[PDB]
Design a protein around this ligand. Structure first.
Ligand SMILES: [Ca+2]
Ligand SMILES: [Ca+2]
Length: 169
């Protein structure tokens, strides 16, 4: 039932070797100046597997808590472990980047191979590539976006769309 458990069930649910899964969670920001309400994607939770305003305040405190828990806690910090850490404080206006684009258009965005990551023009895909990712997939769901990443080239997953649906819709 927890985001973290669903994320975990998602990637240990066999198939290919995904390095991590993240859930980017919808929140809303009211801009008094414009009278606009903007959807913003922010860290919901994540599971790192490895290789082989009251809402605003709750969100920031939960992330700070999650950063604390992850860091504390003296050995090597790997490229993909770093990317995972670095992702926790990232956020995305709706329409912006791979997560914003997934959500805004109810898309799956599936990027398979280094060339796809840098080629997409998403700064986050680009960032992940720098850190040794070769596949990134973002799947819009009811309350945000599931992102899976792998240092392997993965261009197919039989079950993926079905599991994501059961676990997040
Ligand atoms: Ca967690
Ligand atoms: Ca490096």
């Amino acid at each position: 039932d927890t985001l973290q458990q669903r994320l975990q069930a998602l990637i240990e649910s066999a198939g290919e070797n995904w390095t991590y899964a993240i859930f980017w969670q919808i929140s809303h920001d009211f801009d008094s100046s414009t009278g606009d309400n903007t959807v913003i994607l922010g860290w919901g939770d994540g599971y790192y597997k490895g290789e082989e305003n009251t809402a605003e305040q709750e969100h920031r405190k939960r992330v700070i808590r999650e950063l604390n828990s992850l860091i504390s806690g003296d050995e090597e910090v790997t490229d993909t472990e770093w990317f995972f850490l670095v992702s926790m404080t990232q956020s995305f206006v709706n329409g912006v980047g791979l997560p914003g684009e997934s959500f805004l258009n109810s898309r799956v965005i599936w990027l398979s191979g280094s060339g796809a990551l840098t080629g997409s023009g998403c700064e986050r895909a680009g960032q992940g590539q720098i850190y040794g990712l070769k596949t990134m997939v973002c799947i819009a769901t009811q309350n945000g976006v599931v992102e899976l990443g792998s240092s392997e080239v993965i261009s197919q997953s039989s079950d993926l769309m079905h599991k994501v649906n059961n676990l997040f819709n």
